[PDB]
Amino acid sequence: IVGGYTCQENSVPYQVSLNSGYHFCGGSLINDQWVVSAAHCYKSRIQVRLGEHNINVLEGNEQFVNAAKIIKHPNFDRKTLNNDIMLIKLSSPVKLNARVATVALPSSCAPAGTQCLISGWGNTLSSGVNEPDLLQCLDAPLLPQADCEASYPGKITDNMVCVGFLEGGKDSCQGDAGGPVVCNGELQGIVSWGYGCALPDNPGVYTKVCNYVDWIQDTIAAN
Amino acid sequence: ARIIRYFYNAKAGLCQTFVYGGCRAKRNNFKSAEDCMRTCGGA
């Protein structure tokens, strides 16, 4: 997250860190046994870390659970990034508490202008690299699809939504992928892609979760 | 994503690590220093 702020410790209880030796992507806990992330975050072996604030310090609120099942959306395109969503079934149900909680799926698609909260441990710099120890937060609005299209000519599908600022300055960045975009208590987006970070005319592009509620629910029930 | 990969640094004359996002990789991107030097080491 570039241009954000350090989240209040454990104030984003649904935020998880996907780890395979090091933190490499974010994710969101949707039920005590399932996490939703980005398909481009796929790895054959993934450890889910919940209740994290400082990913480099054992604070005492963490829960480490391995991914038993990793299911990418069947229509995920690794080039266009269309359908960039993935589900992870945990090897064991996590213990829910004030610091490890679930986030609700969308009741319907949120319109442009809706204010949301983006979070993650991704790079905090537009130029150069700085990997934060502490979870970063960013309040940003869902942008009109026309503006998203104008910023990314011919690259935006209805399964994508731009969130951020056309003037740049604040945005998600490498390492935030798979993380949450929560608006009014509902997971409306998943950190996916973009050109650079916090650059003018190139706000981040996110997977539009409201288009996948049926797939998510069907997949969980079948696995 | 934050994926650690290797690239050949021509100025340094050796392969170093960098952060690859996980998609649309160019060719100066390897999973190991050995594969990187084998391909780009010259000679």
Partner: peptide, 15 residues
């Protein structure tokens, strides 16, 4: 050596 070896490392669009 191959031309691509002389290009700067490319992070790409995935964030």
């Amino acid at each position: 050596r191959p031309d691509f070896c002389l290009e700067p490392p490319y992070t790409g669009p995935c964030k």
